[PDB]
Homo-oligomer: A and B are copies of this chain.
Amino acid sequence: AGNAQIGKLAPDFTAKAVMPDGQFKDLKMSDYRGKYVVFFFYPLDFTFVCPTEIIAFSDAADDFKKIGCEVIAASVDSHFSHLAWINTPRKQGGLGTMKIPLVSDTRRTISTDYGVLKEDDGIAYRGLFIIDDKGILRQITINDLPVGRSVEETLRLVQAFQFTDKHGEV
Contact = CB atoms under 8 A, between A and B. Distances in A.
Contact of A6 (B125, B161, B170): B125
A164 to B, nearest CB: 4
A142 B144 CA distance: 15
A7 B50 CA distance: 20
A160 to B, nearest CB: 4
Contacts of A142: 6, 139-141
B139 A157 contact: no
B156 A49 contact: no
B138 A49 contact: no
B153 A150 contact: yes
A139 B150 contact: no
Contacts of A118: 6-7
Interface string A118-160: 1000000100000000000011111111111010010011001
Contacts of A125: 6
A78 B96 CA distance: 54
Contact of A139 (B139, B144, B156, B161): B144
A6 B144 contact: yes
A169 interface: yes
A144 B48 contact: no
Interface of A: 6-7, 48-50, 118, 125, 138-148, 150, 153, 156-157, 160-161, 164-165, 168-170
8 contacts: A6-B118, A6-B143, A7-B118, A138-B143, A141-B142, A146-B160, A146-B169, A150-B156
6 tightest CB-CB pairs across the interface, nearest first? A146-B164, A140-B142, A147-B160, A153-B153, A138-B144, A146-B169
